[PDB]
Amino acid sequence: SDCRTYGFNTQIVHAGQQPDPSTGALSTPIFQTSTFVFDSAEQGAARFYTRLGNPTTDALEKKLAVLERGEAGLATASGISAITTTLLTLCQQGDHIVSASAIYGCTHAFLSHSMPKFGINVSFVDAAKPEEIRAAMRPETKVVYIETPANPTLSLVDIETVAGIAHQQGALLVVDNTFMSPYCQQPLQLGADIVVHSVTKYINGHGDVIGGIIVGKQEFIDQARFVGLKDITGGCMSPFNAWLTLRGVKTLGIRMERHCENALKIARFLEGHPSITRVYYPGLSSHPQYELGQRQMSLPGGIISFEIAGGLEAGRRMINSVELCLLAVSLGDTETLIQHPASMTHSPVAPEERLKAGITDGLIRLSVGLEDPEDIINDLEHAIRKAT
Amino acid sequence: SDCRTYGFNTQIVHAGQQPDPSTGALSTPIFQTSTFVFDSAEQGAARFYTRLGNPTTDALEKKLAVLERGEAGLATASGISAITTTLLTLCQQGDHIVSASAIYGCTHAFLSHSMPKFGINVSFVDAAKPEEIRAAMRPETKVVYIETPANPTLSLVDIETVAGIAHQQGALLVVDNTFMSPYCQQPLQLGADIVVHSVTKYINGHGDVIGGIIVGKQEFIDQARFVGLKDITGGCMSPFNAWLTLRGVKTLGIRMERHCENALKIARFLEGHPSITRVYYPGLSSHPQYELGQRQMSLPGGIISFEIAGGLEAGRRMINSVELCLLAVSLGDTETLIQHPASMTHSPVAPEERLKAGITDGLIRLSVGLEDPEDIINDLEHAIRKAT
Amino acid sequence: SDCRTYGFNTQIVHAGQQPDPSTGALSTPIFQTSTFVFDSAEQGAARFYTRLGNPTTDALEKKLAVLERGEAGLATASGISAITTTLLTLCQQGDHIVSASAIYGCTHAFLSHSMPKFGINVSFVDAAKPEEIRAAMRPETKVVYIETPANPTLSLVDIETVAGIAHQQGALLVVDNTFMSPYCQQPLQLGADIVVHSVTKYINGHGDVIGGIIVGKQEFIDQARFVGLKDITGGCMSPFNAWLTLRGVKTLGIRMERHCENALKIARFLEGHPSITRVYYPGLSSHPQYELGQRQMSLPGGIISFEIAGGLEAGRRMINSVELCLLAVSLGDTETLIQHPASMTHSPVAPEERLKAGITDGLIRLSVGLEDPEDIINDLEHAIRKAT
Amino acid sequence: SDCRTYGFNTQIVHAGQQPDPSTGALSTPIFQTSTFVFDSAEQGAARFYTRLGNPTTDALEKKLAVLERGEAGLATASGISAITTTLLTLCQQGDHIVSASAIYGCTHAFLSHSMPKFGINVSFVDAAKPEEIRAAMRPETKVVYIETPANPTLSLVDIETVAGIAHQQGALLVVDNTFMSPYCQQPLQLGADIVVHSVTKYINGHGDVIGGIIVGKQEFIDQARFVGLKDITGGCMSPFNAWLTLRGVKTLGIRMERHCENALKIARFLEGHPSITRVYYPGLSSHPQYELGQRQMSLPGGIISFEIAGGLEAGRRMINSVELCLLAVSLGDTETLIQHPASMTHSPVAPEERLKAGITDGLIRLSVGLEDPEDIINDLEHAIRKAT
Ligand code: NA
Ligand code: NA
Ligand code: NA
Ligand code: NA
């Protein structure tokens, strides 16, 4: 049989994996090795695994390829390495990239500073307006780069529309699908060419692995592996990290269901609360791109942003008053995580520059975990009441 | 007390490490985490660990910094990532690098193809001739890059002399110290600015970790961390890999002593053998740069190359006749590893091009392990006798 | 705050765990150490951790204690070690145990052969009939031992009733709660004194850890630790196994929900199938002790047994015809597992002796996993159709 | 070829291990699995691995069997589990054991209290006097149990002589070889029937694994596995712990050489020091059983005990004044460990009872590590000078 034919939950559990033919071991063994041995000079020449590949990591790459409906996968040392290995494989001096402005922070630094120092220019646009992408394209544009949903207000990008635009002008579309996971969104099915994830978030899900994955056509992935990893970033994933990610992703379906069920309850609670001015969540019909979300996403996700009354000091008081939610900058973990960018990560940044970046003084971001939603709601209500 | 004051074996065991103050645990705990939590909004802003750093990996970086007599260390996903994170941190389009030609293979691809595609030009020279390095320097030269000893005939580069030349012309010297480990050679003490290793080889030593390390001044390492890793390669080392490397490096001193004691015995045996035309080993007085080796290296290393009578077919027969030595392309493991580049790794490469690269049809490379030297010698003698 | 006050899902995620006070690490660090160090002679005497305890394993023990509503937990090397460490701590030569007959196989060997060789006699009874337990009690009875649900037909034992009987006659009740997990059944809340689990099954859930847990009063657990583990079995759990179990148990709630939702669908399908003579599942109203199950269990579990038409050869053909279900003797994993005891595990056992043990020639046992239930059903239907 | 024919260092590296036939992986894969799968009903019946065995742990057991020159090995959860699994497999109510009195502490509790509660009586004797062993034997004696060298003064037991006595009277000899490792002593070669180790000490050597090993005839080991582990202690070793022990034992030869070379230097220093009244070390000719040690042990070991002038307070001051040596109760680690039993572990024990146990107020025990011996000596001298 072929796991590409089975239901998505079945694929999550089985795809890329099989019992060890040699031993019958059901768990994928951890091939924690650097060295692979040949039986003869002839076998040595023939193969020329190699530890540009590894049997454990191979299982993870094959699984994620099945889940994203792509041909092949490539695991990396971090989400940022998945992004840079991809873009540095595709681009050389003189090339151009059109990127969404609403992207993850260290992606922005790589595109803003690193790429131009290698002769690769980047134009940043508002990707919620596909016409801005079209207008920014140039004869030298190799790649359009988008993230959806995007920080910090969970705005969306119409993947199918953008893919059509990119392709008409001879560029590839790369989509960072980290926030959704393949359980909730499948960019390749909508016309994207390449998907990247930080598996650090939902794919692993257990807050104990830093890692990335790239999924795309075999022809591209081979280049990302034999040139990008081998000759540029060196960002390979360790076999133990691959094994942990394989283990975490086993529960991706049930975890995403619970994250999203919890998040919807919490988003509705926050929307009903008189001390909360705004709530950003694709699952609320008041979301600016609600209907696009319903077509493109199977679930509205586990992340919520919201603005508390009273600006900077209220937001600080609120996060200082939670008892259950944990203060941290990651997302996609089993524990509910909360952060207040204006007092935490962006405190040195000038208020008016924060504002330009969509970060208001009162904005809180919440990564909803697997706890009982009544407990998370009660904790939020407690902290909100105190802060306001 | 301060481990920088203690003997080298004491440093190998203790430097960068201490019992866990919280629990008393002697082994460095494995901080297998992606997420770090803040106790308040204020603590969050203050720190802005972060998982651009990790307590386990920090211990490894501090240890290797002590051992190389550098200020700071930075762990990476692979030896190649240590090299590319370094050079991509230092160089931008329009910059120039002078590199030894006798370098590790995937370093050569990065320098030959990847760097020029980012607008960074590289001149390759014979670094055994320091005048060639001087002659190749340009106003835009940022870095001189060397490896010593170098594949495939274990030629040397005079680190102190090259450092003086590089510095006089305003460039940094980066040295790949992988083959020696800090137990046998200390490039920073000889004037190098930056040392890189693949810890995949001797530093870990157990053939089960792919990883790299960079050691240098705090000011440089900070840039390699906060720009190179964060914004370019994303090549961070996982905490488990760091923990395994910490564990492997505990025995670095006793392992290097045994590797080198074994290697000298084997090199002398091979030098006495009438079916072996040449033996390349820094420990033999017939080595072209023997006296330089005696000043610059505390031991002559665990690697030997040698040429067997009868060219390509003899070399193939020989490696096909070993019973104890294992056929593989890595080095620095506890097991003795052997390879015949002409029939294994370089078989597709044209004979005359192999020859230009110092790879003769009969050249065998041997990574000497920790087995009884009489057993390794008996195995070699057996295979040589059969092959010739 | 106190996690004993929060909802069960919140407890599953958080109980026994907290960010590392020293570093802020959210994941419990893996304290993979044998050695703990003292700061002074005085601190050494004072503590006399010790590695009869470990910070990682402590977190697991505290979590499971919260989840079972017991005072304290003790982790072990295997489920069987949890059982034997308990019973060998409690019993000495001349003591007596009343045990259910319908128990796990290697528990039966320990009770049948090992215990009597140490002078500890065991009476086996049908624990579905509490009067049989009462009738078997003796002045020297220290322990009543039960498992519920029990193999192979998922019969039940009324925990509250049995606890009352045991206590009236001055004995402790120990319950193996492995099949249910604390998510579905809480024996201590029903009057049991001690709960044991093989965490190898649902608690870990990922088919990659062998381990056990014991939960009970602090006074008993201290004895099981400082006498049973230290001075009898030596069956301690490794910190890495504890860390993996902590990680697996994070998803216990969502996993048990899905296992049981899937199992109910499959049990109903099997009950409607004309080639299946019997289906044993607590979730079917036709189950002999259905109402007892509804009071004592919050969900009916992820395990089903059923009898296929055509006896031994039909059962063999059926398991040889599945494509998705994996043939194995474990349970509680994310993958659906299937076994046919009469042709697999009990083939050497005489047919009439198998029959006495409740194992008919046509009995199949199924551990329902997290795959799509339609896929599991389609696979079963396919194999059943072929086999019959 | 057969590793039983090779030199001991070669065996240490290679025995029990081979590249993975399926993949070529040189490192033994970590089979971190609980579940093994069958390809058919027939294969299921046939095997009835099983996770009473595991491919990773199997490699460790086979290696240690080669190194001790025994037929078979069995890994366990701890050294104490190796001991109790052995003795509870061999003995039943009514049986008798003759044991050395000078044994490891938690072995003493198991023999003194646990065994008699199961109807198994134990006679303790001074095993340095083989006549005391003979005089204590009874018709029901199944086992003679010895440790050599023994705590706390490193007295010896003549293994060959004791084996002859045990055998003449129809008993087995079990030897705890933990202090020596098979590199320094081979009890089976001297007539012992069974060897046990805590691998927690030198075999693993890295202070990060708790575990045990049993080595003996296939017929016995099968019983220890299929009855002792399966049906009594449940004390199996986890595959990750086995993998770490495999990795640690790779350097056993070079580690034991350095431990013993360091220890001899330190013992000679202490013997020359006027504030040290006694030094116990088999490598000093003043050792009461020096010549026996020279025949039975290939090296004199890495452990030293010594008495400091000034009794209890001097010993306390001394250990409170070390800067490099770490205060801990384990041994065989890469770091030098020191303890003062009278002020640390035996402080509650009455002075006259301590004295009976060979523990004087001034006795210090030292586990010599791999640091530079001059540094350890300088640290000891510093602390001794201060304390006296
Ligand atoms: Na991004
Ligand atoms: Na290099
Ligand atoms: Na049981
Ligand atoms: Na002992």
Tab-separated table of N, CA, C and O and ligand atoms in Angstrom, chain C residues 79-80 83 99 102-108 111 145-147 175-178 196, ligand 3:
chain	number	residue	atom	x	y	z
C	79	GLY	N	6.896	-1.735	33.768
C	79	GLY	CA	5.629	-1.980	34.433
C	79	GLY	C	5.755	-3.158	35.380
C	79	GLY	O	5.256	-3.122	36.506
C	80	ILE	N	6.448	-4.202	34.948
C	80	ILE	CA	6.593	-5.353	35.835
C	80	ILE	C	7.400	-4.969	37.074
C	80	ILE	O	7.074	-5.390	38.177
C	83	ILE	N	5.146	-3.352	39.594
C	83	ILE	CA	4.360	-4.373	40.283
C	83	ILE	C	5.184	-5.141	41.313
C	83	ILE	O	4.752	-5.316	42.463
C	99	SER	N	-5.195	-12.521	44.388
C	99	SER	CA	-5.078	-11.883	43.086
C	99	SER	C	-6.187	-12.282	42.135
C	99	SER	O	-6.652	-13.421	42.149
C	102	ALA	N	-7.606	-13.021	35.991
C	102	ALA	CA	-7.545	-12.327	34.709
C	102	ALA	C	-6.561	-11.171	34.802
C	102	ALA	O	-6.957	-10.010	34.902
C	103	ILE	N	-5.276	-11.500	34.788
C	103	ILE	CA	-4.243	-10.481	34.837
C	103	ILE	C	-3.273	-10.634	33.671
C	103	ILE	O	-3.271	-11.644	32.965
C	104	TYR	N	-2.455	-9.605	33.484
C	104	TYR	CA	-1.384	-9.588	32.497
C	104	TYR	C	-0.403	-10.755	32.685
C	104	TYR	O	-0.047	-11.101	33.811
C	105	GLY	N	0.020	-11.353	31.574
C	105	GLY	CA	0.820	-12.571	31.578
C	105	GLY	C	2.042	-12.621	32.475
C	105	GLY	O	2.168	-13.529	33.295
C	106	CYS	N	2.976	-11.683	32.345
C	106	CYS	CA	4.197	-11.787	33.181
C	106	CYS	C	3.874	-11.364	34.626
C	106	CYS	O	4.702	-11.667	35.518
C	107	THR	N	2.730	-10.745	34.890
C	107	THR	CA	2.335	-10.586	36.279
C	107	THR	C	1.971	-11.966	36.828
C	107	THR	O	2.272	-12.294	37.974
C	108	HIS	N	1.343	-12.781	35.986
C	108	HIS	CA	0.887	-14.097	36.419
C	108	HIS	C	2.061	-15.004	36.780
C	108	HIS	O	2.003	-15.723	37.773
C	111	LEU	N	3.500	-13.954	40.180
C	111	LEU	CA	2.632	-14.356	41.282
C	111	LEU	C	2.566	-15.873	41.436
C	111	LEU	O	2.505	-16.382	42.555
C	145	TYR	N	-4.957	-7.924	44.749
C	145	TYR	CA	-4.373	-7.383	43.527
C	145	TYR	C	-5.334	-7.546	42.364
C	145	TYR	O	-5.780	-8.657	42.066
C	146	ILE	N	-5.681	-6.439	41.712
C	146	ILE	CA	-6.604	-6.503	40.590
C	146	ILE	C	-6.178	-5.646	39.400
C	146	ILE	O	-5.412	-4.698	39.539
C	147	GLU	N	-6.716	-6.007	38.242
C	147	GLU	CA	-6.511	-5.302	36.989
C	147	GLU	C	-7.878	-5.056	36.372
C	147	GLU	O	-8.682	-5.985	36.284
C	175	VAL	N	-4.142	-1.702	42.428
C	175	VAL	CA	-4.818	-1.809	41.146
C	175	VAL	C	-3.858	-1.468	40.024
C	175	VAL	O	-3.247	-0.408	40.041
C	176	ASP	N	-3.733	-2.369	39.057
C	176	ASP	CA	-3.030	-2.058	37.813
C	176	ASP	C	-3.971	-1.274	36.893
C	176	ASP	O	-4.925	-1.826	36.349
C	177	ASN	N	-3.678	0.012	36.715
C	177	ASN	CA	-4.531	0.933	35.961
C	177	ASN	C	-3.970	1.209	34.548
C	177	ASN	O	-4.347	2.174	33.894
C	178	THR	N	-3.080	0.338	34.084
C	178	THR	CA	-2.379	0.513	32.797
C	178	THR	C	-3.316	0.699	31.590
C	178	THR	O	-3.124	1.601	30.771
C	196	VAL	N	-0.613	0.986	40.112
C	196	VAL	CA	0.583	0.765	39.312
C	196	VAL	C	0.234	0.885	37.840
C	196	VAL	O	-0.902	0.618	37.440
E	3	NA	NA	-1.052	-6.636	36.293
